[PDB]
Design a protein around this ligand. Structure first.
Ligand SMILES: N[C@@H](CCC(=O)N[C@@H](CS)C(=O)NCC(=O)O)C(=O)O
Ligand SMILES: N[C@@H](CCC(=O)N[C@@H](CS)C(=O)NCC(=O)O)C(=O)O
Ligand SMILES: N[C@@H](CCC(=O)N[C@@H](CS)C(=O)NCC(=O)O)C(=O)O
Ligand SMILES: N[C@@H](CCC(=O)N[C@@H](CS)C(=O)NCC(=O)O)C(=O)O
Ligand code: FES
Ligand code: FES
Ligand SMILES: [Cl-]
Ligand SMILES: [Cl-]
Ligand SMILES: [Cl-]
Ligand SMILES: [Cl-]
Lengths: 109, 109, 109, 109
């Protein structure tokens, strides 16, 4: 929930996502689109947090990022966007480069 | 099962299937139904949280022949989702349908 | 007009109302309908662009009592929007429906 | 073109890219931005209809690195789409950003 607690969370790992549901079982198409894109580039090692489990987290990640919706994508402790931005980076090669920057070899390469 | 859901929707005049509960909705689409019913002062309706039950979630889509959540039922009859409910709220049809079922909308006066 | 619109949906076996044209649709929701029809090889259909005329945009909603665009009609009867059509595409109902109207789905071929 | 669009967005204090016009929006997401601006007393501003120009439509997505329409610009700074604009409306950041540009929101009165 907290601002200090979320700052830790996003910096904790290279690729961090906030979803409705889980990678195994997403509860929302927008959250799912993110899970599938990560699957396509072969990113198996990322942090996923379920906002349905905690209303304080649901509300807290919005306040932290200044972003009104879920899913939220962080690369390198920095906010990237939601599923629309992510699909866009998937289609124009930008995500492959962002992944390369984190030391992550994308499967589409 | 179509037979169990048949019973469920005949069991109360007003029956809704949501993501979350009326006291804690988990999706703006489901919240829109909740807030519309709150505006009309429809206090006692059965509300079923599909996030708890994967089988109810699929069962209700099969029974309704409708792909998404929320789902609204009046008098055991399928009415629609949030778009239809909002349309009914804006054109007066919801006040009428509720009145024919002996429900007095708070928007009548 | 209800008059003119009733004539439009009964004129052809498959009638769609879209934002845009099948050649260049102007919206993901309308495009989703177009992409489906294409996957089934449905060549002969009437498409009408609601962007062209505000009276059409409002007209088709009041005729179908359906609040959004796209709208799909088969055999003069309202079937639904893009969500309902995807559901039928996935569960095999679209194939059978087309079979009923004497129309060969490409997925059979 | 990047240089051309860069000039275009910097030319006016408020710049929006919509589907349709402020008088006749062709999409709920574009309309939300128009309605939000209207509540702040911003009635006259530069509005470009992407449905009239596929080059501008794609160009603006490339320039902003933002996948969708509407897009809102303030002194040529990208602000975002309707979800962000609505958030700025609710938390008071929109009143504050407009004020810094010498526009006095009707909400401030
Ligand atoms: N265009 C968004 C789609 C995501 C979205 O609109 N999410 C909504 C519905 S799941 C949301 O998080 N609303 C607030 C909430 O439910 O907490 C994106 O690209 O990420
Ligand atoms: N336009 C719909 C909005 C509802 C909707 O698109 N629901 C989606 C997103 S919550 C859904 O039920 N997804 C399937 C699922 O979560 O099981 C309506 O009028 O009800
Ligand atoms: N869930 C809908 C999606 C279509 C939709 O929500 N259409 C909207 C946006 S294009 C609409 O027609 N809104 C009123 C309008 O634009 O006239 C479906 O299954 O067809
Ligand atoms: N979540 C978006 C909603 C706008 C949106 O999803 N726009 C879509 C549908 S109108 C779009 O511009 N799609 C590509 C296109 O039509 O050019 C926002 O916050 O602005
Ligand atoms: S859970 Fe309903 S749209 Fe995301
Ligand atoms: S035109 Fe914007 S969502 Fe259909
Ligand atoms: Cl029965
Ligand atoms: Cl909600
Ligand atoms: Cl009663
Ligand atoms: Cl509109």
């Amino acid at each position: 929930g907290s601002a200090e607690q979320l700052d830790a969370l996003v910096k904790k790992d290279k690729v961090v996502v906030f979803l409705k549901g889980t990678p195994e079982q997403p509860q929302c198409g927008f959250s799912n689109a993110v899970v599938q894109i990560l699957r396509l580039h072969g990113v198996r090692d990322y942090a996923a947090y379920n906002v349905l489990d905690d209303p304080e987290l649901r509300q807290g990640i919005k306040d932290y990022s200044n972003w009104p919706t879920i899913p939220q994508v962080y690369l390198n402790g920095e906010f990237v966007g939601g599923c629309d931005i992510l699909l866009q980076m998937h289609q124009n090669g930008d995500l492959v480069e962002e992944l390369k920057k984190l030391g992550i070899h994308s499967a589409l390469l």
